DNA sequence: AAGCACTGACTCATGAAGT
DNA sequence: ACTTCATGAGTCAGTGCT
């Protein structure tokens, strides 16, 4: 039994490791996408409400 | 007996923390930005009620 | 250079969720 | 309690950095 169990775990570790690498790639992209969107919404709000100090209301967060 | 097993054991832990930390970091940044964006979308709605912002800047698929 | 730290991958032992 | 897949950590092999 140990032989096949060992083989199957070798497959699961490969899958787990690839799963973590893709997860990191994914959140790296989403962080950037959300950050750019944040910049777009702050600019649109400024265009529509030229008299509103957005940065003072909803302070920016680092990245 | 005797091996440089100790050094690599430490390096392995370090390499895994670096990655785990990076992942946690991006996750936090992503979550932080998302909440901020939801507050911005609400502010724009309550400031410019008759504006379809989603048709200008659709919500990012988290 | 040439040695030391970094990382990919295999194995072990446990963890977590569904039966 | 059993079965299975997922994962944190030690270890070895190969890589990369200075």
Swiss-Prot record, chain A:
Phosphoserine, modified sites: 13
Site for Recognition of methylation, required for disruption of latency, residues: 13
Signals that turn on the gene: Expressed in the immediate-early phase of the viral replicative cycle. It is expressed again during the switch between latency and lytic replication. BRLF1/RTA and BRRF1 cooperatively activate transcription of the Z promoter and thereby establish a positive autoregulatory loop.
Region named Basic motif: 5-22
Phenotype upon changing residue 7 to E: Complete loss of lytic replication and expression of late gene expression. Reduced capacity to interact with viral DNA and oriLyt
Site-annotated residues for Recognition of methylation: 17
Chain segments carrying region Leucine-zipper: 23-55
Stretches assigned to the bZIP domain: 2-55
Entry's localization field: Host nucleus
Assigned protein family: Belongs to the bZIP family.
Role this protein plays: Transcription factor that acts as a molecular switch to induce the transition from the latent to the lytic or productive phase of the virus cycle. Mediates the switch from the latent to the lytic cycle of infection in cells containing a highly methylated viral genome. Probably binds to silenced chromatin and recruits host chromatin-remodeling enzymes. Regulates this switch by binding to 2 types of ZEBRA response elements (ZREs): the CpG-free AP-1 like elements (latency) and the methylated CpG-containing elements (lytic replication).
Domains (record comment): Recognizes the CpG methylation marks through a specific serine and a methylcytosine-arginine-guanine triad. The leucine zipper region contributes to homodimerization. The basic motif is involved in specific DNA-binding.
Self-association and partners: Homodimer. Interacts (via b-ZIP domain) with the DNA polymerase processivity factor BMRF1 (via N-terminus); this interaction may inhibit BZLF1-induced transcription of the BMRF1 promoter. Interacts with human UBN1, CRTC2 and RACK1. Interacts (via N-terminus) with human PAX5 (via N-terminus); this interaction inhibits BZLF1-mediated lytic viral reactivation. Interacts (via leucine-zipper domain) with host CEBPA; this interaction induces G1 host cell cycle arrest.
Protein's name according to its UniProt entry: Lytic switch protein BZLF1
Organism of this sequence: Epstein-Barr virus (strain B95-8) (HHV-4)
Stretch of the intact protein here: 175 to 236 of 245
